[PDB]
Ligand binder design. Structure first.
Ligand SMILES: O=C(O)CCC(=O)c1ccccc1C(=O)O
Ligand SMILES: O=C(O)CCC(=O)c1ccccc1C(=O)O
Ligand SMILES: [Mg+2]
Ligand SMILES: [Mg+2]
Lengths: 311, 311
């Protein structure tokens, strides 16, 4: 195109219901920004995704207070052996395991978490993400059952804040709010309803680093940063947010570049010893060209999100 | 701008509900003044904060009667482990501990005060600040429970003067008034109702050093000076007030610069051996630029506060 270009990168394994990650990269005065909302989101919800991309490309991010950020391994809803192998090849001591994947059984989840705990040893930290797939009763039951593997916290066990609050009062395992933070009328409900012990922050859906920092301040709860499975361009913003937070009690979910078959930078944001450096990424003209698709449709989508944001 | 310049400095840890300290610095004939009222305060309440800034930048302060001022360690609502470390490394023999933080348990407060007492040893002085969070009955029993750690005084146990007066009649621990002094229609009601043994003075909220000295005399009660978590510019005014008071029976809460991630001076006002020197501070163009932000919003806010003060 010229400045804003679309890409389509296949994932190494189905994650969040997709097998291909699409988005657009935009070059601005501050550097590169990534606009990659998942397909189903309308312009109104994409507005904030645009705001994040705009901030990254045109405004820049708040200075970091740390030069590196710790990350957790991301384990998709796969089999126990491969789940254990992702952990073994991660270099991370904390792992977040997907559970309650549509079409799978609760037995699969137990086997997966078990495999992950064994792969980490007794010292590892194990989290699970339900993406709100369980009702209150099932959540209390499963959390209790899976806690024999010692859980650090359970991310979004149920769909709504009221449900998280109920679960929180019936289990000892800490609860983290994600969807109730990034896809909710009022994110502060988590705080007021004391529905979670930890608040998850994702840069794009929250409208950028400054927006995410403000929300973290308003909630007054321990926070953790995670990605939306972006290329190194999008991940750099996530790293920027994690590096700007006053305190990072939890390893961040920014080791997701491994989930993609390729990246758009010559020096990808790949963790080393479970840690990522705080740095801007330089897009590789040649690397992008290899995964760049026709920009028309994506440019139209970006324009719609922009309008929604400005109007 | 060329005159008033806005800053945004991240805190090392959440305190008083914020994670970033914003404000404006103004250079006048006398030196630098700081205007940093917290976000929620309207122009009428901000009027005194402006008056303090104006006094510091344009008028100068009353000559000091002492060359250094003693300070107490400020302990945020953190875990017992870190609370102890803050005190042990403070160089202070007096520590003020935050209790009744929204969302925390009374058990946490007991654990925190205990850890602080243990850190200071037997000869230390321990105060607690409730920020008016407790009702009368709760304050009475909590003060009794926490007094097994030997409290110097309890700062603002309840929200209103009438409540402080009732608590004072039922407990043996001295009571200090803070918000009942700085955020009240009639500060002297504290004296008239004999609701406190100690009066807390904060420069910006009270409208400056001269205004604070005037109130100190009228209240006819022992006083202590503390900060509003300012940069060295604002803290210099607090030190100036402490240095001009007849006597300082209590160490002052001016050891708060450590709560900020950075300062605007090359020679920051950090205590050494529990004292701060009484001296003007020189702002560093470089240090300020690093945390400076667009002053548009803040300049508009300062003009409103100033307008409210002059009328
Ligand atoms: O947190 C991680 O380990 C990676 C981020 C992640 O899991 C994720 C990725 C895309 C969409 C949603 C989520 C989620 O946290 O639920
Ligand atoms: O007194 C100290 O130790 C530091 C000053 C302090 O506690 C404070 C700082 C900001 C806002 C309110 C207060 C307070 O004393 O209630
Ligand atoms: Mg999640
Ligand atoms: Mg106080």
């Amino acid at each position: 195109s010229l400045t804003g270009r679309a890409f389509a990168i296949p994932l190494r394994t189905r994650f969040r219901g997709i097998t291909v990650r699409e988005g657009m990269l935009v070059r601005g005065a501050a550097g590169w920004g990534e606009f990659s909302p998942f397909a189903e989101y309308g312009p109104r919800e994409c507005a904030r995704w645009w705001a994040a991309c705009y901030e990254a490309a045109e405004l820049g991010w708040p200075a970091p207070v740390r030069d590196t950020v710790p990350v957790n391994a991301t384990v998709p809803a796969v089999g126990p052996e491969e789940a254990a192998r992702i952990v073994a090849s991660s270099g991370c001591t904390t792992a977040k395991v997907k559970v309650a994947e549509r079409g799978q059984s609760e037995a699969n989840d137990v086997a997966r978490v078990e495999a992950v705990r064994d792969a980490l040893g007794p010292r590892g930290r194990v989290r699970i993400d339900v993406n709100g797939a369980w009702d209150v009763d099932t959540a209390v039951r499963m959390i209790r059952l899976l806690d024999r593997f010692e859980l650090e916290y359970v991310e979004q066990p149920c769909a709504t804040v009221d449900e998280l609050a109920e679960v929180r009062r019936r289990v000892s395992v800490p609860i983290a709010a994600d969807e109730s933070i990034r896809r909710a009328e009022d994110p502060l409900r988590v705080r007021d309803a004391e529905a979670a012990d930890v608040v998850v922050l994702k840069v794009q859906p929250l409208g950028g680093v400054r927006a995410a920092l403000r929300l973290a301040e308003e909630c007054g709860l321990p926070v953790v940063v995670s990605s939306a499975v972006e290329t190194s361009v999008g991940l750099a913003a996530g790293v920027a947010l994690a590096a700007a937070l006053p305190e990072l009690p939890y390893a961040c979910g920014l080791a997701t570049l491994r989930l993609l078959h390729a990246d758009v930078c010559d020096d990808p944001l790949l963790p080393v010893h479970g840690v990522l450096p705080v740095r801007r990424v330089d897009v590789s003209e040649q690397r992008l060209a290899e995964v760049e698709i026709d920009p028309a449709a994506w440019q139209a989508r970006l324009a719609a999100a922009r309008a929604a944001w400005e109007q």
